[PDB]
Design a protein around this ligand. Structure first.
Ligand SMILES: CCCCCCCCCCCCCCCCCC(=O)OC[C@H](COP(=O)([O-])OCC[N+](C)(C)C)OC(=O)CCCCCCCCCCCCCCCCC
Ligand SMILES: CCCCCCCCCCCCCCCCCC(=O)OC[C@H](COP(=O)(O)OCCN)OC(=O)CCCCCCCCCCCCCCCCC
Ligand SMILES: CCCCCCCCCCCCCCCCCC(=O)OC[C@H](COP(=O)(O)OCCN)OC(=O)CCCCCCCCCCCCCCCCC
Ligand SMILES: CCCCCCCCCCCCCCCCCC(=O)OC[C@H](COP(=O)(O)OCCN)OC(=O)CCCCCCCCCCCCCCCCC
Ligand SMILES: CCCCCCCCCCCCCCCCCC(=O)OC[C@H](COP(=O)(O)OCCN)OC(=O)CCCCCCCCCCCCCCCCC
Ligand SMILES: CCCCCCCCCCCCCCCCCC(=O)OC[C@H](COP(=O)(O)OCCN)OC(=O)CCCCCCCCCCCCCCCCC
Ligand SMILES: CCCCCCCCCCCCCCCCCC(=O)OC[C@H](COP(=O)(O)OCCN)OC(=O)CCCCCCCCCCCCCCCCC
Ligand SMILES: CCCCCCCCCCCC(=O)OC[C@H](COP(=O)(O)OCC[N+](C)(C)C)OC(=O)CCCCCCCCCCC
Ligand SMILES: C[C@H](CCC(=O)O)[C@H]1CC[C@H]2[C@@H]3[C@H](O)C[C@@H]4C[C@H](O)CC[C@]4(C)[C@H]3C[C@H](O)[C@]12C
Ligand SMILES: *C(=O)CCCCCCCCCCCCC
Ligand SMILES: [Zn+2]
Lengths: 127, 128, 88, 459, 122, 71, 171, 55, 81, 62, 221, 12
């Protein structure tokens, strides 16, 4: 049932070829030949300064990455949104509708100072 | 021994249970030889063109072409009006149009009266 | 995905290793080039249960159209290398 | 409208007096300048339409169609360059001339204030559109597709000519502004029944209406790419524009005469959508899609509700950009494999990553993914028809299901899967093709931010 | 519960009809029952934005719970006592609901005995 | 992928482990039971009942108002 | 068609795999794996082709009733959970001829090696057609198997696509 | 629900990758000691879904 | 790096429940020539796998001690103030 | 075997078994692995319905 | 009110920033997967501020920032409804997505198109927060359809696998049937109540509601 | 051991 001599020889003929082909699908140590990409002063500054582990500074370096993120992604957008909401949205009727705050008995109101009577005396219970 | 397997339109009979994959007569195997004969020639013709390095483009497939011509262009010239096509055409074509005409016609007349008589509710209906 | 590749030698080593645990061959007489049906005295049903053991070793099925054409441990290594793209 | 008519005429002297190798650059550059100046027609008021003179006027319904028409001419020039490269220079100039005349007749048709002037120009579009199909089609079926297109229209146009003249002898004028004040109710007599048919069947054949649509799969398949874009983008919208105008003088007879054309349309959506599920030709599949989407416009116009007229106008603008984009995408493949069979080429997303993205966006708009204008118009028509009869939601919903299947079926069949092994000439996408698709989808997606300009007079 | 068998697998007139209750007069059988009073006022409940389902006699104790919730922030591991008082008050109100069901249950049996008594003797 | 230990893959043997892996894994399992036990200790009512459900039959007609059959 | 040894061999592997699906635990599978082998061992050889064919049909009928409703499948096999998963990363070889020269220069060595492969392909094409139009019956071939190169330095006919196919984990 | 059902899928992924893209549980077993951290999460999640008290 | 395969002979079906199968098959005159191949699954660090109840009881011993000591602090804390 | 000449416009197109493409020998070396077809093989009249994406007529366990 | 509203809209705007920067504005091919997760981490924190304020005093406000389209007597706006359901689900989705996003960096590290994979996940997250916070049906409908189509692209991620395409297309076949009910709900509310705003639906409680509710049940099925 | 990944032209 095995391979006939003609076939087993053909499979060997191709087998040598394929392994050579797969060997040719390899990259020389120089490749890829990237073009003259320039590095900014910030990129080269950190490469020189980050050579050593120096666990004491890795917190500082992490802070810079996060601090850069916070200002651009959390502080500028909130600035723009707040300016948009306070001076354009809230200048039109009912654009921002807010549920009136809950008023419990025995409370003081900031706007005028009204006081609501606490309650009628309760029939004290237990348990 | 075990209950027979019932083939269906959407459930074929397994090749193992088909009572024709065990007996192989002299003529039964003779035909199968030609099947792999004709289909072996095609595999040869395709591979002469597929592997050719001077060929860049599309290997036209006459089997594919005969398929579309039959599906689209060669239907009407082989159409004969008879009881089979005439009735199926009236049932599929005219049928549904008539059915939906009465469903919509009945409902709208029924709805119209409820507006003349005031029995319909349109209290907050000002977008139409 | 992080699984180390399979070298040509690694395929043979595990191929032979599995055969040695099959209680139908003499380990000393068992080399890479051994015909199951002509040298080591195995029946076809013995070879089939060798392929099933081989598939569960490398974790991939092999067709019965070709698995019924492997008659040597070396042929098994060639088939796996061809399928799994091993070159060195 | 002379500030657009005269510049369009001057495209012909420019094309014929230009150098041999700069005809595609001169015509494309200046036809884009005409399109830019068409934004001045957006000066619309909430009470009165923009009336220019005794002949021409523009309102919120004509303006979006005028902008779409002048926008397509530059696009059609780009798509025609590949298959005309080996063509004689003299004949390559006559091709560019037929398109210019087609634009000239179209802008004058969408602004004509007098219906007979509208009819003459409405009927003049057949001549250049026929020559494009019959002269510059590739297959042998173009000759027969030319006759089907020619005679289906005229068989309904000639009765329209009698009906329009009969109205003038009775009302005294066909000026559309006059007809808004002198219109009189239509009594229920057998004569008025046939007056209704004569006034509408010309516009039903061009939309087209299911049952009279056999010309579309022939004209939109055997026509070249330029012919297919204008055919499916503006020449179907002449039917819709006609009905939106001439229904002013058919009430209340439209209340009961519209029933047979609503069942052929509501049922025709399902039948034509279903046909797309088994088409073997990629260009044919896009054609049968036009029938399904144009069946909603017919329903919207015939029920005469403010929401339905806003939807119909938005449906026509949305479908013109989407339908044209699909034809362009189909032709880019044809320029490589030179066959329209849909299953011949598969797994194209492996070879052409960016052109596959255009396929995705083109498919989503076809199935009305919100908030695209495809969905805005299709939603309004579905909101208005529900008030007509709540049972219609059954038919509208079913078609939305079948639309998703065939829209995503052609995307999967050609873009996904495994590539054909013997198709070895799929060269990368040229900048022309990518620019051609981007000019279809970017303006379509931009109208979402300010959709009120394509909703029509009843907005 | 277990009464389901009686209502479905047993006699009907004995078991009440929750949809139609109450049936017998609110005062018959008792000597001028004292009306159940509510401490919380309509204006008071509105200012607390109490859900309608919570506008029950048990109100005026949920208002206590809310004030502690706001006056102990963040201390969600608190105000447990006020939670119990509102729970307990609902429990007492819930308990009385069973009493009406049980009271209504037997009063139906009386109508059976009295009607049976006159029917049987006559 | 990016980091982590570099434990080699055993061929047929039990895989290698690390100190932090087992301690951290074993830590959370213990914290689960402490939470269950502590939570059960202080609020066992929620998982065993809050208040006793009165038995309807043990009541008496006096607290219900069932008139005598005589009238 | 498929002879008689092949069917019983095919039928034997399925029984083990389907049985293996019920067993799950590896101690049980060996307990019944031998029995199944014994059941075939009962009717080994025995000649009498008419009786052997009759038994196999009953064996097939016996199998179908007992097949696992959800058989185990290897991930990278038809019906598995990874079949064709990596066909979306298998770009053909001819697509490299269309690269822009500005991006061929990033792999000067790889394309230099490609030139040799293409050069070999053109040179060897003529013989492979010669070799195939001589070692074939007059009425066209009757088998899908191809003959090898009956010489030294000559590549097997029709080798380009069988050799240069995409890798099984191309990315 | 989102917490422990999200956790269960992530923990299952750890099993699948470690077994050479194997999903069927008929070719698994003996992972209590091999993957303790996944084991702990697969058990914490397997109990929250069941509804163990106070989780 | 090179892979170091353990010795093939060390996998002995003895002790594992695989030889038991051979013993059970031997009771009817049958042998299974694969016991050793599966031997490694029942030996080494894979043997003595926990039971289902133990898996649910994981970490209870360590956790329980925290509970008893913790509640003791509460009792003392209540008395102090 | 041509289709019945009953006037439905089937012509002389070869009728073939209504077997879905999902139930063809998968391990074979098809010219179109996705479709399970060979160059020149006469395609079924309803081939686009039987592609592996749409309809499966394979034997069922029950 | 000023801090409550701003910290809720920034959450949604923050999630789109990685998508906006996909326009070759910042080119970090090897760090984009880490970029997206960091955005989700910062979105969880900002969402907690609105959540607490609803815990403290139960503050609820409605934002209608943009006037989009006005059809006769119907006015459509890009409204956001920050209430009980929005302020508790938003932290959970981001918290859970945060873990899935972090887990994906490990699981899909070898994928060649991991960059495209983290755009689709982020896009789905946006379409879920549009559905969650919608104050009108049309805005709710945009998110309802959006999550459907993103599920289609992610399910058929390995598009060479014919089984993936079938499962992807099948997932849009069933949701389209449900969409029939959603269109029915939009139709009934416009016809009879003359609105799509959730505020007006709850303020005109109709006695008869079997039809619109049946649509929602079909849609939710 | 980096290997060359064939991809369609990403320049155009
Ligand atoms: C008003 C209701 C809507 C009415 C119109 C639409 C109703 C549904 C009828 C259309 C279904 C067919 C759609 C076109 C074919 C696309 C799907 C296909 O071809 O098969 C692939 C898939 C089959 O995938 P599969 O998972 O079953 O397996 C395929 C076989 N393998 C895996 C081996 C490749 O078909 C479907 O998924 C169709 C599902 C929808 C049909 C069932 C609807 C039930 C509704 C109950 C309420
Ligand atoms: C909560 C509410 C929602 C619930 C939703 C779920 C409801 C499910 C209800 C139960 C479903 C039961 C399925 C019923 C469909 C049965 C269809 C059928 O039996 O016919 C199929 C037909 C078989 O015919 P054939 O193959 O030629 O003959 C076989 C002989 N061995 O082969 C064919 O396909 C031909 C066409 C048949 C058409 C028959 C009409 C249907
Ligand atoms: C109303 C239509 C009624 C149609 C039913 C009656 C027709 C019929 O039953 O068949 C009669 C006849 C067949 O008789 P027979 O002798 O067998 O064939 C001719 C042999 N020389 O038929 C014939 O031979 C001639 C054909 C009869 C006329 C058929 C035309 C009507 C049916 C076409 C419907 C088209 C549907 C249009 C759809 C619009 C879009 C929805
Ligand atoms: C397939 C079937 C194709 C054939 C069907 C068409 C039949 C045409 C015959 C109908 C003509 C009707 C007509 O002539 O009406 C006359 C009417 C008289 O004028 P008037 O003074 O207004 O009425 C009071 C007079 N005592 O005049 C009027 O009042 C109004 C006349 C309007 C013009 C009618 C034009 C008829 C067009 C036929 C419908 C279109 C069919 C398209 C397909 C044709 C092919
Ligand atoms: C392939 C060809 C496709 C092109 C076909 C050409 C178009 C179809 C022919 C035009 C038909 C126009 C109608 C015929 C003239 C009838 C004029 C008339 O006076 O009808 C009056 C009738 C009753 O009026 P009434 O409803 O009581 O008034 C209140 C209104 N709310 O008013 C009514 O009841 C409305 C009309 C009732 C009849 C509608 C029947 C619908 C049947 C489905 C459409 C089939 C179309 C043909 C299909 C080809 C086969
Ligand atoms: C196959 C289609 C068969 C169509 C049969 C006609 C049924 C028409 C119909 O009345 O549908 C039910 C519904 C009832 O009307 P309703 O407003 O709900 O109140 C009762 C008023 N008679 O009428 C309606 O309002 C239409 C209901 C639409 C159902 C949508 C279901 C979506 C899924 C499909
Ligand atoms: C129905 C709901 C579903 C709708 C979906 C439709 C698709 C949505 C597509 C995304 C659109 C996002 C909408 C949010 C951006 C809004 C744009 C905008 O601000 O428009 C100007 C707006 C004033 O517009 P308004 O007063 O409402 O007048 C009617 C406008 N049609 O506001 C202003 O007055 C401008 C003030 C801007 C101040 C910011 C300046 C700082 C930022 C600049 C640097 C960046
Ligand atoms: C008595 C009434 C006369 C009418 C007045 C207009 C005609 C004037 C004569 C111009 C003849 C000439 O020299 O043509 C000069 C040019 C065009 O010439 P062309 O060869 O096509 O140049 C282009 C050649 N391409 C196309 C091969 C590149 O035409 C004009 O500038 C406008 C004429 C209107
Ligand atoms: C903050 C995050 C991880 C930092 C860390 O290791 O802790 C890092 C990873 C990649 C960075 C981002 C990418 O560099 C892309 C953007 C361009 C600039 O780097 C600044 C903003 C920018 C948006 C960066 C913000 C921040 O520095 C990021 C998001
Ligand atoms: C009342 O509402 C009971 C409804 C049925 C729920 C309980 C079903 C199981 C009861 C079994 C215990 C029976 C009492 C011993
Ligand atoms: Zn071409």
């Amino acid at each position: 049932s095995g391979y006939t001599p003609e076939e087993k020889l053909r499979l060997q003929q191709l087998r040598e070829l394929r392994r050579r082909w797969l060997k040719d699908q390899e990259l020389s140590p120089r490749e890829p030949v990237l073009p003259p990409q320039r590095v900014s002063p910030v990129e080269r500054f950190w490469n020189k300064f980050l050579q050593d582990g120096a666990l004491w500074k890795n917190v500082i370096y992490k802070t810079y990455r996060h601090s850069i993120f916070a200002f651009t992604h959390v502080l500028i957008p909130v600035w723009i949104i707040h300016y948009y909401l306070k001076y354009h949205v809230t200048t039109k009727p009912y654009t921002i509708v807010e549920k009136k705050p809950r008023i419990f008995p025995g409370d003081t109101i900031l706007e005028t100072g009204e006081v609501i009577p606490p309650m009628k005396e309760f029939p004290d219970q237990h348990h | 021994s075990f209950p027979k397997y019932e083939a269906s339109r959407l459930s074929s009979l397994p090749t193992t249970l088909d009572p024709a994959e065990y007996d192989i007569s002299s003529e039964t195997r003779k035909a199968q030889a030609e099947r792999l004969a004709i289909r072996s020639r095609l595999k040869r013709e395709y591979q002469l063109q597929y592997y050719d390095p001077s060929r860049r483009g599309v290997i036209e497939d006459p089997a594919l072409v005969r398929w579309t011509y039959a599906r689209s262009a060669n239907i009407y010239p082989n159409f004969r009006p008879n009881t089979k096509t005439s009735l199926l055409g009236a049932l599929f074509g005219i049928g549904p149009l008539v059915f939906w005409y009465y469903v919509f016609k009945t409902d709208r007349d029924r709805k119209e009266k409820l507006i003349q008589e005031g029995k319909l509710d349109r209290t907050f209906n000002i977008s139409y | 995905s992080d699984a180390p590749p399979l070298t040509l030698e690694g395929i043979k080593d595990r191929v032979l290793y599995v055969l040695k645990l099959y209680d139908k061959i003499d380990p000393e007489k068992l080399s890479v080039n051994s015909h199951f049906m002509k040298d080591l005295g195995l029946d076809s049903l013995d070879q089939v249960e060798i392929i099933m053991a081989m598939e569960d070793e490398f974790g991939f099925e092999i067709p019965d159209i070709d698995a019924e054409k492997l008659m040597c441990p070396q042929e098994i290594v060639d088939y796996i290398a061809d399928k799994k793209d091993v070159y060195e | 409208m002379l500030k657009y008519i005269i510049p369009t005429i001057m495209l012909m002297p420019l094309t014929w007096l230009s150098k041999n190798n700069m005809i595609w650059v001169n015509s494309t550059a200046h036809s884009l300048l005409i399109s830019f100046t068409s934004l001045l027609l957006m000066n619309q008021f909430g009470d009165n339409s923009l009336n220019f003179s005794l002949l021409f006027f523009s309102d919120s319904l004509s303006t979006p169609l005028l902008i779409l028409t002048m926008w397509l001419l530059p696009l059609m020039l780009m798509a025609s360059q590949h298959h005309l490269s080996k063509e004689n220079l003299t004949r390559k100039k006559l091709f560019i001339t037929m398109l210019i005349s087609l634009q000239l007749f179209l802008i004058m048709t969408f602004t004509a204030m007098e219906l007979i002037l509208f009819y003459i120009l409405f009927e003049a579009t057949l001549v250049p559109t026929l020559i494009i199909i019959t002269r510059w089609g590739n297959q042998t079926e173009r000759l027969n597709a030319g006759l089907y297109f020619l005679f289906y229209t005229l068989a309904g146009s000639l009765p329209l000519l009698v009906a329009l003249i009969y109205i003038q002898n009775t009302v005294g004028s066909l000026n559309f502004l006059m007809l808004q004040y002198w219109v009189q109710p239509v009594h229920n007599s057998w004569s008025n029944v046939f007056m209704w048919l004569a006034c509408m069947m010309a516009f039903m054949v061009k939309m087209p209406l299911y049952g009279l649509h056999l010309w579309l799969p022939k004209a939109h398949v055997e026509a070249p790419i330029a012919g297919s874009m204008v055919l499916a983008a503006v020449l179907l919208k002449l039917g819709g524009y006609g009905m939106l105008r001439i229904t002013l003088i058919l009430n209340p007879m439209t209340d009961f005469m519209a029933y047979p054309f609503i069942m052929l349309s509501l049922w025709g959506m399902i039948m034509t959508s279903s046909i797309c599920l088994r088409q073997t030709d990629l260009k044919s599949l896009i054609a049968y899609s036009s029938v399904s989407h144009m069946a909603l416009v017919i329903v919207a116009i015939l029920i005469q509700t403010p929401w339905s007229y806003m939807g119909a106008t938005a449906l026509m603008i949305a479908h013109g950009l989407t339908s044209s984009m699909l034809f362009c995408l189909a032709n880019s493949n044809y320029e490589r494999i030179h066959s329209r069979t849909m299953i011949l080429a598969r797994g194209l997303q492996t070879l052409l990553p960016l052109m596959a993205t255009w396929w995705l966006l083109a498919s989503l708009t076809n199935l009305a993914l919100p908030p695209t204008i495809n969905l805005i118009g299709e939603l309004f028509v579905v909101m208005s028809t529900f008030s007509w009869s709540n049972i219609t939601i059954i038919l509208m919903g079913v078609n939305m299901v079948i639309t998703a299947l065939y829209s995503l079926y052609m995307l999967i069949m050609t873009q996904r899967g495994k590539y054909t092994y013997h198709i070895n000439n799929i060269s990368p996408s040229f900048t022309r093709e990518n620019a051609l698709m981007s000019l279809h989808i970017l303006p379509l997606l931009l109208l979402t931010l300010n959709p009120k300009i394509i909703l029509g007079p009843l907005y | 519960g277990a009464h389901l068998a009686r209502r479905y697998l047993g006699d009907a007139s004995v078991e009440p009809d929750p949809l139609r209750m109450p049936t017998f007069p609110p005062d018959y059988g008792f000597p001028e029952r004292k009306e159940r009073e509510m401490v919380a006022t309509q204006q008071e409940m509105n200012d607390a934005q109490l859900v309608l389902q919570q506008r029950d006699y048990c109100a005026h104790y949920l208002i206590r719970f809310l004030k502690c919730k706001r006056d102990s922030f963040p201390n969600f591991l608190a105000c447990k006592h006020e939670r119990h008082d509102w729970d307990y008050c609902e429990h007492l109100d819930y308990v009385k609901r069973m009493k009406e069901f049980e009271r209504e249950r037997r009063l139906l049996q009386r109508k059976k005995r009295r009607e049976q008594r006159e029917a049987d003797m006559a | 992928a990016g980091g982590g230990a570099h434990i080699e893959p055993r061929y047929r043997q039990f895989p290698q482990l690390t100190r932090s892996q087992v301690i951290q894994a074993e830590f959370f399992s213990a914290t689960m039971w402490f939470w269950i036990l502590w939570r059960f200790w202080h609020d066992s009512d929620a998982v065993l009942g809050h208040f006793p459900y009165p038995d309807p039959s043990q009541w008496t007609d006096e607290e219900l108002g069932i008139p005598p059959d005589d009238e | 068609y498929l002879t008689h040894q092949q069917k019983v061999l095919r039928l034997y592997k399925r029984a083990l795999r389907h049985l293996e699906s019920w067993c799950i635990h590896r101690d049980k599978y060996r307990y019944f794996a031998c029995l199944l082998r014994a059941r075939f061992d009962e009717h080994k050889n025995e000649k009498d082709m008419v009786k052997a064919t009759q038994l196999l049909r009953e064996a097939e009928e016996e199998f179908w009733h007992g097949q696992h409703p959800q058989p185990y499948i290897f991930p990278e096999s038809p019906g598995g959970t990874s079949y064709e998963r990596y066909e979306c990363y298998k770009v053909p070889e001819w697509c490299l001829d269309d690269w822009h020269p500005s991006e061929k220069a990033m792999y000067p060595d790889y394309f230099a090696k490609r030139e040799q492969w293409k050069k070999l392909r053109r040179e060897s094409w003529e013989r492979e057609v010669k070799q195939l139009q001589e070692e074939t019956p007059v009425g066209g071939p009757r088998t899908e198997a191809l003959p090898p190169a009956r010489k030294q330095g000559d590549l097997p006919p029709l080798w380009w696509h069988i050799v240069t196919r995409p890798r099984e984990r191309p990315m | 629900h989102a917490f422990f059902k999200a956790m269960l899928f992530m923990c299952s992924g750890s099993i699948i990758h470690s077994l050479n893209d194997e999903q069927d549980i008929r070719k698994m077993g003996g992972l209590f000691k091999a993957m303790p951290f996944t084991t702990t999460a697969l058990i914490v999640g397997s109990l929250a879904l069941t509804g163990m008290p106070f989780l | 790096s090179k892979m170091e395969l353990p010795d093939y002979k060390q996998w002995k079906i003895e002790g594992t429940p695989l030889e038991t199968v051979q013993e059970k098959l031997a009771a009817r005159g049958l042998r299974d020539p694969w016991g050793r191949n599966e031997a490694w699954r029942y030996m080494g660090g894979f043997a003595n796998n926990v039971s289902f109840v133990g898996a649910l009881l994981k970490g209870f011993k360590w956790g329980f001690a925290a509970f008893v000591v913790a509640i003791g602090a509460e009792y003392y804390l209540e008395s102090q103030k | 075997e041509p289709y019945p000449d009953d006037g439905t416009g089937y012509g002389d197109y070869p009728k073939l078994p209504d077997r879905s493409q999902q139930e063809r020998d998968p391990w074979y070396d098809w010219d179109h692995p996705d479709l399970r077809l060979n160059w020149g093989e006469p395609m079924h009249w309803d081939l686009d319905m039987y592609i592996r994406n749409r309809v499966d007529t394979s034997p069922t366990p029950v | 009110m000023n801090m409550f509203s701003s910290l809720s809209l920034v959450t949604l705007l923050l999630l789109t920033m990685p998508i906006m920067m996909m326009s070759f504005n910042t080119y970090k091919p090897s760090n984009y997967p880490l970029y997206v997760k960091t955005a989700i981490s910062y979105a969880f924190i900002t969402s907690m501020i609105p959540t607490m304020m609803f815990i403290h005093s139960g503050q609820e406000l409605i934002i209608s920032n943009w006037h989009w389209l006005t059809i006769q007597t119907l006015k459509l706006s890009l409204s956001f409804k920050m209430d009980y359901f929005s302020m508790m689900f938003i932290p959970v989705a981001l918290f859970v997505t945060w873990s899935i996003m972090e887990f994906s960096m490990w699981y899909m590290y070898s994928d060649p198109n991991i960059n495209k994979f983290f755009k689709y996940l982020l896009l789905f997250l946006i379409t879920m927060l549009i559905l969650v916070t919608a104050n009108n049906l049309f805005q709710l409908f945009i998110g309802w359809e959006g999550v459907g189509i993103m599920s289609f692209l992610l399910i058929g991620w390995w598009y060479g696998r014919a089984d993936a395409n079938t499962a992807a297309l099948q997932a849009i076949l069933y949701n389209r049937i449900g969409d029939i009910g959603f269109i029915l709900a939009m139709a009934w509310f416009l016809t009879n109540l003359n609105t799509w705003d959730l505020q007006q639906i709850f303020m005109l409680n109709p006695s008869d509601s079997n039809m619109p509710l049946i649509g929602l049940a079909l849609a939710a099925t | 051991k980096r290997l060359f990944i064939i991809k369609p032209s990403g320049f155009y």
